[PDB]
DNA sequence: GGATTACACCCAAGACACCAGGCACGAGACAGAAAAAAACAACGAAAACGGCCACCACCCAAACACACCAAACACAAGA
């Protein structure tokens, strides 16, 4: 694509049925600097949804 | 007999006690226990009948002797 030159090797090419799985990165990316702590231990809480 | 059996992360879903016999008080009845009296043991006082010493006579015990029997050294017999 960059140069239009032929590729020295030939490429196995054709349609294939792919699937969109439920695991998206935007549902997983989590960061925490400081946030809510637990009542008993005063340590950071557990959960991406709970920060 | 107990005790331990990978590590990290994501999401969703339900419950966050209800209801029934024991403690206190709440009052009777035989049993847990207390009070009394009458038939239980003994002792004081009188009555007369059983117990002890006499008197007494007939039945059992001892002496005498009888004849009778059991028995024991030894002169004789015997192997």
The encoded tokens of residue A49 equal 């949804």
3-state DSSP assignment of residue A50: coil
Chain B nucleotides near the protein (CB, 7 A):
9-12
**Å between A48 CA and B13 C1'?**
18
Distances in Å between the Cα of A4 and the Cα atoms of A16, A18, A30 are: 25, 28, 42
Distance of alpha carbon A7 from alpha carbon A14, whole angstroms: 17
Phi, psi values for residue A37, rounded to 5°? -120, 165
**A44, A35 contact by CB (below 8 A):** yes
**Å between A8 CA and B77 C1'?**
176
The encoded tokens of residue A7 equal 């590729």
3-state DSSP assignment of residue A51: coil
CB count in 10 Å sphere of residue A45: 13
**Å between A34 CA and B5 C1'?**
36
**What would the DSSP string read from start to end of A5-40?**
PPPSS------------S--GGGT----SS--B-TT
């Amino acid at each position: 694509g960059h140069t239009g030159k032929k590729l020295m090797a030939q490429v196995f090419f054709g349609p294939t049925y792919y699937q969109r799985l439920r695991h998206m990165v935007d549902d997983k990316i989590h960061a925490r600097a400081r946030g809510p702590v637990q009542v008993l231990t005063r340590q950071p809480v557990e959960g991406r949804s709970r920060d």
